[PDB]
Amino acid sequence: HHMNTDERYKLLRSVGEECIQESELRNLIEKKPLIRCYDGFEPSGRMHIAQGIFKAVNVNKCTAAGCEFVFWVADWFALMNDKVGGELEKIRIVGRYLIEVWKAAGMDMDKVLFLWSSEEITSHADTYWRMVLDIGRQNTIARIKKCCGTLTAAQVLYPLMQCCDIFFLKADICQLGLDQRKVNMLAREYCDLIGRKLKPVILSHHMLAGLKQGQAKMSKSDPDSAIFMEDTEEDVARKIRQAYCPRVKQSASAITDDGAPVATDDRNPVLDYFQCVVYARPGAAATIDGTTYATYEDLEQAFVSDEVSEDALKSCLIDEVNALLEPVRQHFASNEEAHELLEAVKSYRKDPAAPAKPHACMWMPALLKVPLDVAEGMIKVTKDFIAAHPEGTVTLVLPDWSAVASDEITGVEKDISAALQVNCALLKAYGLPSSVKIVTENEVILGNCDDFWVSVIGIARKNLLSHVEELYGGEVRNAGQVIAALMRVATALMLSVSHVISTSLDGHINAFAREYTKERIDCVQTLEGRIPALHRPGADDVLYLDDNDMDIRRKIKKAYSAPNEEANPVISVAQHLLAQHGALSIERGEANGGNVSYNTPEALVADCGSGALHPADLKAAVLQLLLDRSAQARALLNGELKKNMTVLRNAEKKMAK
Ligand SMILES: N[C@H](CO)Cc1ccc(O)cc1
Ligand code: NA
């Protein structure tokens, strides 16, 4: 029997307690041959009747209605505890057992796939993890909290990973529990954020009610709240018998944004199992004392009218459920290979490094135009660090991932990579030591992708979301900033770092590294404020590395200075130049004062505030000194970095919007 297109729709729809866009569901049924349903799970190893029987009923309906059904096995998290214990292979077996309960429960596997997160993710780490960070980048942290006093660790990440899966697999339908609602809804919202008309339909299935009064769904910490598949028939009888069983008809449970089942005095888990585990089966009906009830409704009518006695209804269900489970018990009884997985599942129920030589770590500012004051700061800390530790090493990280996460500059990968390579090239030319190694985050991730993201979560699971919000000042811009912070600590540990250097632009972020390693990693702070903005105290009035010679002149012209001033910006810059060089000479025509070299900043002030060091002569000498000092750098603007600069002005254009 081939179902007509209306009957296919009806059958697939029946799966869902809600359907987000039935129109979308239809058009899928009407146009698309191998509609993708996906659903996912972390192998627990103790399978309840909803995972065994009910899922199978719904998988079968989807394959019937002409879907391919992909199971996403979230086994990736097993890698956390893998170096010790090797829990990946153990969780694969728990999974393999689950699939095998599924075969024997009657899942038609013809059109059903199983994918392993561990296998799949690590085969396209690039495409996956970049999307994870983008989903965070484009979303307000408040909105990622809704997918989960204030206890929240970095479980802000789990939703992003989940939301990624949806796109990674190319799911057309999300056929998961109603409680996964908000993550799935996030995916629909995300399509909009990437100009993508076709959206995933959310076909949320019912959450089975807990057996005892006041338990909206099954309880992990109460075995009698649900029927489990390894429950021998005496257990089934005992669990049902005591079950809550109101004499009330069972209307739909109006949906909360949360997806979260709510226990009520009206809901009857005996009647829920009868709807979900019995009648949901294509041809099945329940029989009590010689009468057979064709629909769930008929049985309900019976119970409430008082034709079927509570004891009898529960007797019916027990016979019914042992009937569904018996095939599955024999199979594990007789199929050795099956049995072994079980006894394996049973047995499982048995319950950093400091670098010898010092090494500093600095993060290049993800900025389009880098101030000279920040640049010089970086060069100084480097030179200071090396002098203090000549044996040691310094490393500059270009954050070509984390900076995309935080929505830095345009928040586009190509723009940000360009901004970094240019400004870093300029920084080396401006005087950053050769001895300093330059590495990109991409280089560090590829280097050890598996371990990197594992570390990221490991760290994540030991710290509160609120704390990462503190690190950023208490508010975060987007959920991507949260990922950036974690990544930093991760990079630090992989780079085997003893010191983290921090510019003015890093704020407190980098302390995380220190706190995490329990103060083993020391913090070093940049020394800035030696080159101020050029305008009068109280724009393009800041000197940046990428200033060409035409730019400098303009800025040093506009720069504020008046006569008889002991302090202003042009003096500050002058005072700065004088310290590094060791001196500062200025050419003057005799009768304007004559040529005169200052080897001490006091003297400079002395002459400026009271005396005939005219500002014009000071600026002339300062402007020329910046030019001499910036030569190599500006040669790269017009030369080797010419092409890469193009992207940057294109970026700037965008952002002016
Ligand atoms: N989040 C669910 C319970 O932990 C399992 C899951 C479902 C779908 C996925 O793509 C990933 C995990
Ligand atoms: Na298959």
Could you confirm whether domain 124-168+352-528+642-657 is CATH 3.40.50.620?
yes
Q: Tell me where in the chain the CATH 3.40.50.620 domain(s) lie.
A: 1-123+169-351, 124-168+352-528+642-657
Separation of CA 229 and ligand 2 centre (Å): 22
Task: State the Cα–Cα distance between residues 481 and 467, nearest whole angstrom.
Answer: 12
Q: 3-state DSSP call for residue 84?
A: coil
> Which residue is closest in CA terms to ligand 1's atom 7?
40
How was this model experimentally determined? X-ray
In 10 A of CB 624, how many CB atoms? 14
* Structure tokens given for 418: 């360009």
Q: What is the resolution of this structure in A?
A: 2.9
- Contact indicator for 163, 183 with CB cutoff of 8 Å: yes
User: In sequence order, what are the residues at sequence separation of 6 or more whose Cβ sits closer than 8 angstroms to the Cβ of residue 621?
Assistant: 574, 584, 585, 586, 587
Our mutation pick for probing the ligand 1 site, out of 162, 166, 190, 203, counting the most ligand atoms within 8 A of Cβ, is 162
Q: Tell me where in the chain the CATH 1.10.240.10 domain(s) lie.
A: 547-641
Q: What is the 3-state secondary structure (H, E, C) of 410-424?
A: CCCHHHHHHHHHHHH
- CA-165 nearest atom, ligand 1: 10
* Structure tokens given for 339: 């049995």
Q: Which ligand is nearest to the CA of 163?
A: 1
Our mutation pick for probing the ligand 1 site, out of 42, 163, 164, counting the most ligand atoms within 8 A of Cβ, is 42
* Structure tokens given for 350: 């048995």
- Contact indicator for 256, 262 with CB cutoff of 8 Å: yes
Task: State the Cα–Cα distance between residues 380 and 478, nearest whole angstrom.
Answer: 32
Among 140, 43, 35, residue whose Cα is nearest residue 348: 43
Task: State the Cα–Cα distance between residues 520 and 500, nearest whole angstrom.
Answer: 11
Question: Could you tell me the strand order of the sheet in which 201-204 lies?
Answer: 18-20, 201-204, 173-174, 35-41, 67-73, 112-116
If you write DSSP's letter for every residue of 319-334 in order, what string do you get? Answer: HHHHHHHHHHHHHHHH
- Contact indicator for 190, 479 with CB cutoff of 8 Å: no
Separation of CA 173 and ligand 2 centre (Å): 18
Q: Which helix (H) or strand (E) holds 623?
A: helix 615-638
Q: Which ligand is nearest to the CA of 99?
A: 2
Q: Which ligand is nearest to the CA of 108?
A: 2
Our mutation pick for probing the ligand 1 site, out of 72, 147, 166, 185, counting the most ligand atoms within 8 A of Cβ, is 72
Separation of CA 114 and ligand 2 centre (Å): 7
- CA-158 nearest atom, ligand 1: 1
The backbone torsions φ and ψ at residue 355, rounded to the nearest 5 degrees and listed phi first, read -70, 135
Q: Which ligand is nearest to the CA of 59?
A: 2
Separation of CA 111 and ligand 2 centre (Å): 5
- Which residues partner with 394 through β-bridges? 360
Under CATH, what is the fold of the domain 547-641?
Answer: Tyrosyl-Transfer RNA Synthetase (1.10.240)
Separation of CA 210 and ligand 1 centre (Å): 21
What single DSSP character describes residue 51?
A: I
Q: Torsion-angle region of residue 564: left (phi > 0), alpha (psi -120 to 50) or beta? A: left
User: In sequence order, what are the residues at sequence separation of 6 or more whose Cβ sits closer than 8 angstroms to the Cβ of residue 634?
Assistant: 547, 548, 549
- Which residues partner with 547 through β-bridges? none
- Alpha-carbon distances, residue 267 vs 155, 171, 217, 250, 261 (angstroms): 31, 33, 11, 6, 11
Separation of CA 284 and ligand 1 centre (Å): 30
What single DSSP character describes residue 260?
A: -
Task: State the Cα–Cα distance between residues 98 and 341, nearest whole angstrom.
Answer: 9
Among 127, 119, 122, residue whose Cα is nearest residue 89: 119
Task: State the Cα–Cα distance between residues 607 and 305, nearest whole angstrom.
Answer: 106
- Contact indicator for 178, 261 with CB cutoff of 8 Å: yes
Q: Which ligand is nearest to the CA of 116?
A: 1
Separation of CA 48 and ligand 1 centre (Å): 17
Could you give the count of Cα atoms lying within 13 Å of 428 in the half-sphere of its Cβ?
A: 14
Task: State the Cα–Cα distance between residues 214 and 361, nearest whole angstrom.
Answer: 54
Q: 3-state DSSP call for residue 641?
A: coil
Q: Which helix (H) or strand (E) holds 61?
A: helix 55-64
For the chain, state the CA radius of gyration: 34
Our mutation pick for probing the ligand 1 site, out of 180, 185, 207, counting the most ligand atoms within 8 A of Cβ, is 180
- CA-39 nearest atom, ligand 1: 8
> Which residue is closest in CA terms to ligand 1's atom 8?
40
Separation of CA 643 and ligand 1 centre (Å): 44
- Alpha-carbon distances, residue 518 vs 50, 352, 467, 512 (angstroms): 44, 11, 15, 10
> Which residue is closest in CA terms to ligand 1's atom 2?
41
Separation of CA 247 and ligand 2 centre (Å): 42
CA pseudo-torsion sign 215, 217, 223, 224: positive
Separation of CA 564 and ligand 2 centre (Å): 86
- Contact indicator for 423, 636 with CB cutoff of 8 Å: no
Q: Torsion-angle region of residue 34: left (phi > 0), alpha (psi -120 to 50) or beta? A: beta
User: In sequence order, what are the residues at sequence separation of 6 or more whose Cβ sits closer than 8 angstroms to the Cβ of residue 473?
Assistant: 507, 508
Our mutation pick for probing the ligand 1 site, out of 176, 207, 218, counting the most ligand atoms within 8 A of Cβ, is 176
Task: State the Cα–Cα distance between residues 226 and 220, nearest whole angstrom.
Answer: 9
Q: Which ligand is nearest to the CA of 114?
A: 2
User: How, if at all, do strands 359-363 and 499-502 pair?
Assistant: parallel
Angle between the N-to-C axes of helices 615-638 and 569-581, in degrees from 0 to 180, rounded to the nearest 10? 70
Among 554, 493, 501, 550, residue whose Cα is nearest residue 527: 501
User: How, if at all, do strands 286-288 and 291-293 pair?
Assistant: antiparallel
Contacts 24+ apart (CB under 8 A), 410-415: 410/651, 410/654, 410/655, 411/137, 412/651, 413/130, 414/647, 415/647, 415/648, 415/650, 415/651
Separation of CA 74 and ligand 2 centre (Å): 18
412, with CB counted inside 10 A (0-12, 13-18, 19+), is: middle
CATH number of 1-123+169-351: 3.40.50.620
Task: State the Cα–Cα distance between residues 513 and 497, nearest whole angstrom.
Answer: 10
Helices (H), 390-464: 402-405, 413-430, 441-447, 449-460
Task: State the Cα–Cα distance between residues 488 and 503, nearest whole angstrom.
Answer: 14
Contacts 24+ apart (CB under 8 A), 642-650: 644/418, 644/421, 644/422, 645/422, 645/546, 647/414, 647/415, 647/418, 648/368, 648/415, 648/418, 648/419, 648/422, 648/546, 650/415
> Which residue is closest in CA terms to ligand 1's atom 10?
162
Separation of CA 115 and ligand 2 centre (Å): 11
Helices (H), 78-194: 87-105, 117-121, 125-137, 141-145, 158-168, 181-193
User: In sequence order, what are the residues at sequence separation of 6 or more whose Cβ sits closer than 8 angstroms to the Cβ of residue 165?
Assistant: 38, 40, 72, 117, 171
- Contact indicator for 223, 195 with CB cutoff of 8 Å: no
> What is the CB < 6 Å shell around ligand 1?
40-42, 72, 74, 162, 165
CA pseudo-torsion sign 641, 644, 649, 651: negative
Q: 3-state DSSP call for residue 106?
A: coil
Q: Which ligand is nearest to the CA of 110?
A: 2
